[PDB]
Write a protein that binds this ligand. Structure first.
Ligand SMILES: Nc1nc2c(ncn2[C@@H]2O[C@H](COP(=O)(O)OP(=O)(O)OP(=O)(O)O)[C@@H](O)[C@H]2O)c(=O)[nH]1
Ligand SMILES: Nc1ncnc2c1ncn2[C@@H]1O[C@H](COP(=O)(O)OP(=O)(O)CP(=O)(O)O)[C@@H](O)[C@H]1O
Ligand SMILES: Nc1nc2c(ncn2[C@@H]2O[C@H](COP(=O)(O)OP(=O)(O)O)[C@@H](O)[C@H]2O)c(=O)[nH]1
Ligand SMILES: Nc1nc(NC2CC2)cc(-c2cccc(Cl)c2Cl)n1
Ligand SMILES: [Ca+2]
Ligand SMILES: [Ca+2]
Ligand SMILES: [Ca+2]
Ligand SMILES: [Mg+2]
Ligand SMILES: [Mg+2]
Ligand SMILES: [Mg+2]
Lengths: 423, 54, 436, 314
């Protein structure tokens, strides 16, 4: 049945997560109360991947909502589609994590993690063939970052042979809540390097710049940023949710996108960036590979693509798709490694997303991603050199040595990208 | 060009045209390989669960 | 009457198997419900078509086939397809989760858990045979199941059915219709399968794709397009086994006629004519014309240049309004106008087989009904070009160990990669010597 | 835009076409091992023709005909002419040659015996008067040495005619209107001056001057007395192997530039010496000939945003 178990942790995690379910529920014709009212059978073929059959032809998202504070999870329950989630799948504490990785991972988070693992188990036990897990979270805060990775570690221990994917929001000073985000993100990246198979890197700096420059949104909100994320999340999971078999299941796509186990951090991209006119296939292709449409605040013209996966949605001509896809790379084959033949794969889906005659989602495994980790590492080191703000973490029982190790681990990651960018 | 062995039946025929004359592993051995692969997987999992336990 | 058991492994093997048995049924006058009025030996008989079909007391003709796949998506379409009534559950085998395009996963991890079951279902087909002559094994090179589980199955088949012949129909990987690791799986399964296959027919998806676009005007051909063309070519190859005739009547003859050297057991296939069905009026090609087309690279199952190789054996299978007179006249004229160098140690000749029934086409299909077609099976060294291409792509990734961790993580060790590659290097050398 | 890749840094000719290709702002020089190319200026030996024409969406063209070596090797050329019904027994323009490995080691001495009975000097490579000297030197081919060649005056010196022929993907046969003679500059001694391989600048004489000499010394023209024979030998050799090297219905395209070397005897009869598959050009002619290569051979398949060739029809 190739079921997926969705987990969303923390404020950012639950807000990205909540809109994801709102978007794909719409695509699959599921109303705010779990009733299906779709006009096509394609909507129900792969509905089992993210929803469970409930009594009365109700579809209940196979999602687990997690947070150390209530509130973000109270708003979800009160927002649009909030009634669609299983009440038992809201797992929350009262203390909060104070934007502190240590609190989410070691103190506050440890108190609550077994309750989450009980719900995860209950969901997995009723899967005909569990495909894997997907987690939404930020890396800059405390719950999604510190507890989110603690979850991933606990899940791997109990399901060591299942795929673990994350949609991870990287912090940026240009859209910053607290000054310690580089610490929390540096600590989380090492967890992800070890315990995820695919991490979709969503950089809040890129999201902002797109809203400001392209979308020309003076003063963007988190809603605006999350509008681009849910559209991206909808695109990357399109091949998992509708008939088609190119990167059909999580393991298959991991096998084709990850040539080295630690280099599994992907640059997202979407087109058209969102009025009544539909883009032509040439316009989709050129924009999708354009840096401005990249969601990881990285210029791919500074690195080389290890692998690339492009998904086109809407009724179009596959011929023009090939013509432009083969065109864009044959015209810029300087940015694709020559030691992975045919490393650009294209998928097509008839069902277009809501309100768009056709769109394109981009998933790239580029060595340019090292720029994003360079940003984090430099910001981390700027403070760590002076042990600034470190008392927030030592007060939770962490030692400075754990920071030093995280720093070394990410610097290692950066050099592991530069190695393959010059080979 | 010589036609030879021209066979004919109700559903067709066949012949040969010559244009020029000319001038294992055991069931046990397989199990050993399969069980050996399984062993290496079990070991890699053991190291993982030990890594996690740490 | 010697029986032939067909085995379909992985998506490509199963979907191609479906297309073949639909064509077989149309060719033999077998309705979807599994019975043929023309058969007067109800519940028995040992006619030529019985080599592929058993018979029940109710006049049902059940294929001597087994469908094996590690996920149930593709085989479920057999259980619910137009020909679901042909097969019974015992011959449809599906696992829970597939090999994720990972040879090591299909061969070691998952293969070890299902191999005994497959052999059991096959045994129940063998036990039903008065004189089983061997197996026909359909699979992709690139799939994790088609590559990984097939080679394990071939290993065990050589153990359990030592005296039996085994032929392959192999789908060679083409980036136009594909997974990035397919070269790895291709070399791995070729190395492990080499000494267990008596004769293997490679079909490169790149060639099928281009024939569909070029001849059938299909702008973007789908697997259904590709599979209905492949089935025609498979049918004309297996036609001698299920019709009256004198050429290639048992599996052993394929080896005898096409494979002098055991390791070089990959005959090249060329088919003609492929004609669009939208063309109501199309001139019927002559014997000489379709025989000449058998030497145009654009009609081969694998794009290569036989002009720069050497022939070891050449076999012409005609279907339709053909008489030996026209063939010889066609061969005489072609010999003086093309490059046909046989190896010194082999006679320069052609084994010809004619079946008067013109090729069958699937009603509502892309291929036009023609009055005569030919499939040429020729063992030429030129097909080593395909090994060279595949080995080169393998070398590019393996130099960086790209993706290797997926196979090691499944129980394989790097040693198998280099070992399999060295076998492929010696295979290219074998063609080099024969073709100098 | 189009993309090509260079794989023979030594090629004098194609270093120039690659310079012109870039000088159009519509060709991109890729890494020598990048398979996503439109045109390959391939290597001289072991060119992997088997990996061409398999890239989706790429129309691929290469500057060598797979199988053209049968014409461009001393031995195979002798073997081709003798065993080709299109040429054998009708080849009055190729001196009798023999292939003998250090095989027709016997048939050579057969006709050689009659010679001494009745001119009997031969030459071998891959110049002596008796077969014993030749075999002691030595795969080598041997053919009758043209004892009476046409000598230019003044200087009493033998020459060497080199013609450049371009064969495009359609197997059209284009003869560059500019040829060169390679003059020994040494008085011919019937008993350095025998070899002409590299009075006139650069020891090379172009057609305009050679034609004037013929009109003055022999009351004839280059076209009538020699060029008609040149075109005939070129067409015979290339039509002979067309079925074996044509990329007409092939998954990739071929073209190639050939250097035919001829010789002229006292009777103004043209003889074919050999065919080079990787020839160089005359410095005074690289510009025009290399642009013509781009016009007819390259941009004919990959177009851009009079004629220096003589199309030998067939
Ligand atoms: N001609 C043809 N090729 C196919 C078909 N299905 C898959 N392929 C080719 O087979 C290769 C992929 O292998 P599959 O057969 O799909 O995979 P599998 O054998 O089921 O193995 P796993 O899915 O990894 O468990 C690709 O190169 C496809 O182009 C088909 O129906 N017809
Ligand atoms: N049969 C013959 N009679 C008279 N002279 C001959 C001859 N064969 C060869 N020569 C002379 O030998 C010289 C070299 O001819 P040859 O073609 O064999 O050199 P080569 O092929 O090794 C280098 P290139 O590619 O420039 O020709 C020529 O200048 C020619 O004058
Ligand atoms: N794109 C996006 N980013 C968010 C959102 N909420 C918080 N963030 C980012 O996430 C980080 C703060 O972490 P947060 O999720 O609020 O902490 P947590 O609740 O303990 O997991 C900062 O980098 C914020 O910029 C959101 O709704 N959308
Ligand atoms: N490699 C790959 N491929 C995919 N599909 C499109 C290529 C056709 C989807 C995904 C995926 C699936 C779940 C979660 C996350 Cl973060 C990702 Cl990135 N990964
Ligand atoms: Ca507490
Ligand atoms: Ca507990
Ligand atoms: Ca019967
Ligand atoms: Mg917050
Ligand atoms: Mg499969
Ligand atoms: Mg020479």
């Amino acid at each position: 049945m190739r079921e997926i178990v969705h987990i969303q942790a923390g404020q950012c995690g639950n807000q990205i997560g909540a809109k994801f379910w709102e978007v794909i529920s719409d695509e699959h014709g599921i109303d705010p109360t779990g009733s299906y009212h779709g006009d096509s059978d394609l909507q129900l073929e792969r509905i089992n991947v993210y929803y469970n059959e409930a009594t009365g032809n109700k579809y209940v998202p196979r999602a687990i909502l997690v947070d150390l504070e209530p509130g973000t999870m109270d708003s979800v329950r009160s927002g649009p589609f909030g009634q669609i989630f299983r009440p038992d799948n809201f797992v929350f504490g009262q203390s909060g994590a104070g934007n502190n990785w240590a609190k989410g991972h070691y103190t506050e988070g440890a108190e609550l993690v077994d309750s989450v693992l009980d719900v995860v188990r209950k969901e997995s036990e009723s899967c005909d063939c569990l495909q894997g897990f997907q987690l939404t979270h930020s890396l800059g805060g405390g719950t999604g970052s510190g507890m989110g990775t603690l979850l991933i570690s606990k899940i791997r221990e109990e399901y060591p042979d299942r795929i673990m994917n994350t949609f991870s929001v990287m912090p940026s000073p240009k859209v910053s809540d607290t000054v310690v985000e580089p610490y929390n993100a540096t600590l989380s990246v090492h967890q992800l390097v070890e315990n995820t198979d695919e991490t979709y890197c969503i950089d809040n700096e890129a999201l902002y710049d797109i809203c400001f420059r392209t979308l020309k949104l003076t003063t963007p909100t988190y809603g605006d940023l999350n509008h681009l994320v849910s559209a991206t999340m909808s695109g990357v999971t399109t091949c998992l949710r509708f008939p088609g078999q190119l990167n059909a299941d999580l393991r298959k796509l991991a096998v084709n996108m990850v040539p080295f186990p630690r280099l599994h951090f992907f640059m997202p991209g979407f087109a058209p960036l969102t009025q009544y006119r539909a883009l032509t296939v040439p316009e989709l292709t050129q924009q999708m590979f354009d840096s401005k449409n990249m969601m990881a605040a990285c210029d791919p013209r500074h690195g080389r693509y290890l692998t690339v996966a492009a998904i086109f949605r809407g009724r179009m001509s596959m011929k023009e798709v090939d013509e432009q896809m083969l065109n864009v790379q044959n015209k810029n084959s300087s940015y694709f490694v020559e030691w992975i033949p045919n490393n650009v794969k294209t998928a097509v889906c008839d069902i277009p997303p809501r309100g768009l005659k056709m769109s394109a989602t981009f998933i790239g495994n580029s060595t340019a991603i090292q720029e994003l980790f360079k940003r984090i590492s430099e910001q981390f080191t700027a403070m760590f050199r002076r042990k600034a703000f470190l008392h927030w973490y030592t007060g939770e029982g962490m030692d400075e040595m754990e920071f030093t190790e995280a720093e070394s681990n990410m610097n290692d990651l950066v050099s592991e990208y530069q190695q393959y960018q010059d080979a | 060009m010589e036609v030879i062995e021209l066979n004919k039946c109700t559903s067709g025929q066949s012949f040969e045209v010559i244009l020029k004359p000319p001038s294992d592993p055991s069931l046990e051995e397989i199990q050993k390989k399969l069980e050996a692969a399984e062993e290496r997987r079990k070991y890699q999992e053991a190291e993982l669960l030990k890594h996690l336990a740490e | 009457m010697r029986e032939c058991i067909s085995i379909h492994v992985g998506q490509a093997g199963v979907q191609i198997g479906n297309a073949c048995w639909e064509l077989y049924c149309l060719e033999h006058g077998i309705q979807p419900d599994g019975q043929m009025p023309s058969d007067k030996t109800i519940g028995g008989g040992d006619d030529s078509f019985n080599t592929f079909f058993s018979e029940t007391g109710a006049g049902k003709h059940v294929p001597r086939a087994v469908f094996v796949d590690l996920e149930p998506t593709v085989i479920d379409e057999v259980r619910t397809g137009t020909y679901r009534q042909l097969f019974h559950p015992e011959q449809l085998i599906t696992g829970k989760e597939d090999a994720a395009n990972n040879y090591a996963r299909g061969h070691y991890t998952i293969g070890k858990e299902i191999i005994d079951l497959v052999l059991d279902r096959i045994r129940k087909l063998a036990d039903q045979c008065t004189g089983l002559q061997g197996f026909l094994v359909f699979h992709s090179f690139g799939g994790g199941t088609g590559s990984g589980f097939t080679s394990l199955l071939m290993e065990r088949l050589s153990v359990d059915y030592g005296k039996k012949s085994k032929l392959e129909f192999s789908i060679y990987p083409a980036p136009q219709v594909s997974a990035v690791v397919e070269p790895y799986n291709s070399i791995l399964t070729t190395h492990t399968t080499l000494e267990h296959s008596d004769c293997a027919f490679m079909v490169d998806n790149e060639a099928i794709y281009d024939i569909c676009r070029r001849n059938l005007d299909i702008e973007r051909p789908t697997y259904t397009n590709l599979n209905r063309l492949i089935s025609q070519i498979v049918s004309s190859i297996t036609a001698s086994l299920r019709f009256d005739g004198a050429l290639n009547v048992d599996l052993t003859e394929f080896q005898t006629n096409l494979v002098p050297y055991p390791r070089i057991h990959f005959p090249l296939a060329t088919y003609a004519p492929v004609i669009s069905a939208e063309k109501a009026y199309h001139e019927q090609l002559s014997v000489a014309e379709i025989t000449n087309a058998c030497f145009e690279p654009a009609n081969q199952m694998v794009k290569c240049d036989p002009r720069h190789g050497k022939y070891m054996a050449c076999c012409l299978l005609y279907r339709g309004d053909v008489v030996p007179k026209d063939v010889n006249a066609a061969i005489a004229t072609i010999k003086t106008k093309r490059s046909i160098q046989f190896v010194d140690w082999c006679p320069t000749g052609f084994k010809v087989g004619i079946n008067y029934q013109p090729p069958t086409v699937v009603p509502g299909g892309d291929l036009a009904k023609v009055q005569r077609a030919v499939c040429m099976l020729s063992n030429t060294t030129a097909i080593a070009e395909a090994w060279a291409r595949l080995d080169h792509k393998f070398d590019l990734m393996y130099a960086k160990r790209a993706f290797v961790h997926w196979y090691v993580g499944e129980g394989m060790e790097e040693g198998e990669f280099s070992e399999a590659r060295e076998d492929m290097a010696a295979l290219e050398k074998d063609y080099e010597e024969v073709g100098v | 835009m189009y993309t090509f890749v260079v794989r023979d840094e030594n090629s004098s000719v194609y270093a120039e076409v690659s310079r012109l290709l870039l000088a159009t702002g519509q060709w991109k020089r890729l890494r020598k091992d990048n398979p996503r190319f439109n045109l390959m200026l391939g290597e001289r030996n072991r060119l992997p023709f088997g990996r061409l024409g398999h890239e989706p969406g790429l129309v691929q063209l290469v500057n060598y005909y797979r199988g053209a070596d049968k014409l461009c090797r001393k031995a195979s050329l002798v073997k081709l002419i003798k065993t080709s019904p299109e040429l054998s027994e009708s080849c009055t323009w190729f001196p009798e040659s023999y292939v003998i490995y250090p095989d027709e080691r016997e048939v050579f001495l057969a006709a050689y015996n009659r010679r001494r009975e009745g001119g009997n000097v031969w030459i071998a490579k891959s110049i002596s008067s008796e077969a014993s000297e030749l075999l002691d030197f030595i795969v080598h081919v041997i053919q009758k040495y043209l004892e009476k060649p046409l000598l230019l005056e003044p200087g009493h010196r033998k020459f060497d005619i080199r013609s450049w022929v371009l064969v495009d993907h359609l197997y059209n046969i284009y003869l560059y209107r500019e040829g060169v003679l390679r003059t020994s500059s040494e008085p011919y001694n019937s008993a350095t001056c025998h070899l002409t391989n590299h009075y006139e600048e650069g020891n090379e004489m172009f057609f305009e001057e050679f034609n004037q000499y013929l009109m003055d010394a022999l009351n004839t023209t280059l076209e009538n007395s020699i060029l008609l024979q040149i075109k005939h030998i070129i067409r015979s050799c290339l039509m002979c192997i067309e079925p074996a090297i044509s990329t007409k219905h092939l998954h990739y395209q071929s073209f190639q530039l050939f250097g035919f070397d001829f010789m002229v005897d006292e009777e103004l009869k043209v003889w074919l010496i050999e065919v080079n598959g990787a020839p160089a050009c005359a410095q005074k002619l690289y510009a025009e000939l290399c642009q013509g290569i781009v016009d007819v051979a390259i941009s004919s398949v990959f177009p851009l945003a009079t004629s220096i060739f003589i199309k030998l029809h067939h």
